């Protein structure tokens, strides 16, 4: 993931953690091959397990998936109807 | 420790080290009062289970019969059967003139006396008196 | 536990820590006196305590459990229905 | 601490480290000022986190608390309903 | 949090987690800005997510929330008709 | 008789080898080891 991609991620830290629906997000990760099962199972765990600590050890995760991460996990977004979210997203790279 | 039991020791030392947790021989080795808090801070400085155990017998070869059993003990008490094995033949037998006086009086500090010699009474009284 | 035994756990490193239930596993281990409590609590407490990582911790502590680990291994493998997996371990030790 | 209760702490270390329930005990330390809340947090997470090694820190720990450190320490055990420990303790320190 | 009222907390540790009923704190303690919602969500699910292990990490996070954070928390307390245990902490504080 | 500790300890430049060719005098052997 270039630098850009995963200064938006931080920039956009707060209201990814606070808006991200995990529990529908997860086949949509793997279609995309975007995360191993395990590695899904993982973060599922961390923190306390709420929705909040899931979705952020996902983003935290999701710099280190590729250089196609960002793009890919907006389609994600996109395929489990969270536009808005994904709308926020790429009008940031955009911008 | 006795020569047989250090030899024991020294043959089998590296199966020991490969296999030895520290953590619960030390334990066992401190409460029979034959390894200090000190050795076992020193012990437990090493970075990993094998560096542990390699100080720890590095110690215990210095140390008398006691401890060879104290270490044989707790090893056979963790379970260890094999490494117990190993050491079993190295196992040292453990436990007015009187032990006093030959303990405290060997430093040097006397010439023993002769082979014959009548005992003079009433003298050595009044030295002791004095 | 002799290099053989040894070479043989991590040669199947990866399907053991993939396929072994654990939580069952114990009262096997304790009946055939491979493992003190204590040891199953810090085997327990392994890295993030997954299954996962329970497995790895114990198959790795294995190796130094006696000459006879392996076998007395696979035996509670057997007991608590995971005869694939024991299955699969024989097959290599004879192999 | 003086080198008798010291020396009842390493005798019987055994006994300490395999029957001191930890978790139970925090309140009574605190409420008799034996540990600031710090201390107990890092004891907390001593070696593996377990009982055993939470307790084994503890009264390590505890040999550099104070001239009545040991005293006081009985007198938790006592107030938690750790009698047979503080009674195994208390016949040591007299006799 | 002077000492204090820190060391008031301690002192009433064991009856606070004993007494206090949380599911109808929540909404007072927001009202006088004693904590964030997130804080909320990650102190009930702390421990076993039950009333005690709540309790706990309530009055543990309590002492970092401010320096009126325990006056405000009676208040609360009288707000959702506790005012038993409201009753014991003032008369504490005052002692 | 020679054995594993015989030669453990004793060769730590305690004794000399016995020659290549000896016979056995048991009996005075047997008088030190007494006294």
Same mark, same amino acid.
């Given at each position: ?6 200064? +938006? ?19 949509? +990760? ?22 909040? @600590? ?9 710099? %280190? ?8 996990? $907006? ?21 | ?17 490969? @296999? ?9 080795? $401190?409460?029979?009062?034959?390894? %200090? ?44 059967? @094999? +490494? ?47």
């Amino acid at each position: 993931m270039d630098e850009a991609d995963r200064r +938006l991620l931080r920039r956009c830290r707060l209201r990814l953690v606070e808006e991200l629906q995990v529990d529908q997000l997860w086949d949509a +990760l793997l279609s995309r091959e975007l995360f191993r099962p395990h590695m899904i199972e993982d973060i599922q765990r961390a923190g306390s397990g709420s929705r909040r @600590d899931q979705a952020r050890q996902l983003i935290i995760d999701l710099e %280190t998936r590729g250089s196609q991460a960002l793009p890919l996990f $907006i389609s994600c977004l996109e395929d489990t109807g969270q536009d808005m979210l994904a709308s926020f997203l790429r009008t940031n790279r955009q911008a | 420790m006795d020569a047989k039991a250090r030899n024991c020791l020294l043959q089998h030392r590296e199966a020991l080290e490969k @296999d030895i947790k520290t953590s619960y021989i030390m334990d066992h080795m $401190i409460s029979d009062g034959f390894l %200090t808090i000190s050795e076992e801070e020193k012990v437990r400085n090493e970075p990993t289970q094998q560096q542990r155990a390699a100080m720890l017998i590095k110690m215990i070869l210095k140390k008398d019969n006691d401890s060879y059993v104290s270490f044989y003990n707790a090893l056979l008490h963790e379970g260890y059967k @094999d +490494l117990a094995a190993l050491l079993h033949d190295g196992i040292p037998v453990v436990s007015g003139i009187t032990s006093y006086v030959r303990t405290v009086l060997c430093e040097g500090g006397v010439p023993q006396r002769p082979v014959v010699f009548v005992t003079r009474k009433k003298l050595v009284n009044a030295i002791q008196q004095k």
